[PDB]
């Protein structure tokens, strides 16, 4: 019974007000690998020591390793679907960006995420380099910077469990997960020029009430239509924790997309229906105002696997 990381629990609890998305690369050498392995061993204790004193702080961290990271830190028994994220070239472009380790810190307060990130980066020193750091907040009643409530159709409880955790199909890595992270930059002027009823056709739901539109009055290119895929005639779900971010003083207004799935082809199928179209050409108009700048795939091991990792200096 491998204990799994808090992948779906935080979302289902609904207490995250702040998040930090740290993407780093391991520097060349073996001391770097030893330091990373020591952090893998002590990460759960670090999270407990940072977040225990704060009642209702809801601190949690999720660590993920990419394909290159895995190759360099562990052996060759790679997980089944751990590979380099593939760039997409359709009506819109989805780039593939570097990154070896991913830390997804969430808490009901910013200082907990800040302190955990500081502790993680101080225990790593020069063994790593930072490729992406992003501080995200909750925008009003779970809305994104486009004004729509995001996360309504996320699976909950057992549904999220079967959506994210790997089963017997890869018996060695049962309890793990896969994640795909993308960073978007929005043009809110262009988005706000469009009327509300049209934006609601583009999304598929109502703006203020957050009610799904009836199937008759939604276009084929509705976002919640192109992201609704089926396997063997049954609906399949992924788990999303998209987070708004930005700085008004520099002009940055963006959304960090993070998607969890036991099978990463589901997320890639959604990404192909969006950037290329389903049918081709019939792409997603959110991409008209949203630009993707990063994209990476990570494998999320179990807590049991992480705690049993030895530095082997
Ligand atoms: C690779 C997949 C994927 C990407 C990328 C993605 C990118 C984005 N999304 Fe969005 N989104 C994806 C997959 C979904 C799903 C699976 C659903 C659920 C639809 C359903 O009916 O089951 C969804 N998105 C649904 C939504 C909804 C409304 C319903 C809900 O929250 O459940 C909103 C407002 C939304 N998104 C916004 C956005 C924005 C904004 C971006 C990027 C800028």
Numbering used by the authors: 3 to 315
Pull verbatim passages from the article behind this deposition.
Encapsulation is mediated by specific cargo protein motifs known as targeting peptides (TPs), though the structural basis for encapsulation of the largest encapsulin cargo class, dye-decolorizing peroxidases (DyPs), is currently unknown. In this study, we report the structural and functional analysis of a DyP encapsulin system from a Gram-negative pathogen – Klebsiella pneumoniae (Kp). DyPs are ubiquitous, often homohexameric, heme-containing enzymes, named for their ability to oxidize and degrade a wide range of synthetic dyes – with concomitant reduction of hydrogen peroxide to water.
To investigate the influence of encapsulation on KpDyP and to compare the activities of encapsulated and free enzyme, a C-terminally His-tagged KpDyP construct (40.6 kDa) was heterologously expressed and purified. The structure of the free KpDyP hexamer was determined to 2.4 Å via D3 symmetry refinement followed by local refinement. Cryo-EM density for a non-covalently bound heme cofactor – one per subunit – is clearly visible. The heme group is coordinated by residue His225, representing the proximal ligand to the heme iron. Arg242 is the residue closest to the heme iron on the distal face of the heme group. Moreover, the heme cofactor is substantially buried, with the entrance to the active site partially obstructed by an adjacent subunit at the two-fold interface. The KpDyP surface was found to be predominantly negatively charged, which is in agreement with its theoretical isoelectric point (pI) of 4.6552. The entrance to the active site is also highly negatively charged. In line with the predicted disordered state of the C-terminus, the last 60 residues – including the TP – are unresolved, which is generally observed for encapsulin cargo proteins in solution.
